[PDB]
Amino acid sequence: VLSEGEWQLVLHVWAKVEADVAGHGQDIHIRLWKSHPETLEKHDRFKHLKTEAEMKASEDLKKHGVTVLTALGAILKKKGHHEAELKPLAQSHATKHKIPIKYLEFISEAIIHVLHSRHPGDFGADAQGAMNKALELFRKDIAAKYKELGYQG
Numbered sequence: 001v002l003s004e005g006e007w008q009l010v011l012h013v014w015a016k017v018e019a020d021v022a023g024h025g026q027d028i029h030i031r032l033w034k035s036h037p038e039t040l041e042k043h044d045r046f047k048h049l050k051t052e053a054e055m056k057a058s059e060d061l062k063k064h065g066v067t068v069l070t071a072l073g074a075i076l077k078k079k080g081h082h083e084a085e086l087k088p089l090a091q092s093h094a095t096k097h098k099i100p101i102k103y104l105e106f107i108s109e110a111i112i113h114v115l116h117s118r119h120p121g122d123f124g125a126d127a128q129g130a131m132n133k134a135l136e137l138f139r140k141d142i143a144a145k146y147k148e149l150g151y152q153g
């Protein structure tokens with residue numbers, strides 16, 4: 001569990017994300033796919049995007065990033081009290097999309113990279129550690145739900 005101070009650092013940087021959710025979501029996807037191209041294979045639509053400029057020009061991808069960050073933001077704002085929000089996400093990611101926990105590690109890395117790239121003055125070592133803990137809690141709780149659903153992930 002995170003301390004109150006750690007949650008405040010998480011939500012402080014999250015407020016910066018909320019100034020441009022769409023742009024952050026695009027950058028996170030592009031960073032994830034560049035670092036781990038196998039993840040781009042899970043999007044039947046997005047996997048045919050060939051260049052960074054094509055990725056930025058995709059309204060579908062931009063909309064998807066807002067959907068992703070809206071879901072993650074709603075979870076983070078619960079400060080760990082997120083079972084109701086997390087359960088449907090685990091259901092779809094385990095049973096329909098088949099997303100292994102390691103891919104959630106990859107997107108967590110991309111999130112931290114983009115947040116530090118855009119907001120270094122609000123995302124130093126302490127805030128990075130807090131965000132790392134919050135995303136680790138998210139992944140640990142998702143992994144438990146995966147197992148409950150019969151998916152080892």
Ligand code: HEM
Nearest residue numbers: 039042043064067068071072089092093097099103104107
């Ligand atoms: C922070 C982690 C993530 C969050 C909050 C998140 C959230 C979402 C949401 C809200 C949706 C739409 C509703 C649904 O189907 O559940 C979605 C769909 C989907 N997600 Fe994720 N997701 C995450 C990570 C990933 C990763 C790492 C992958 C693949 C490597 C992935 C693959 C997909 C796919 C294939 C879909 C359905 C196709 C689409 O709607 O674009 N997700 N995700």
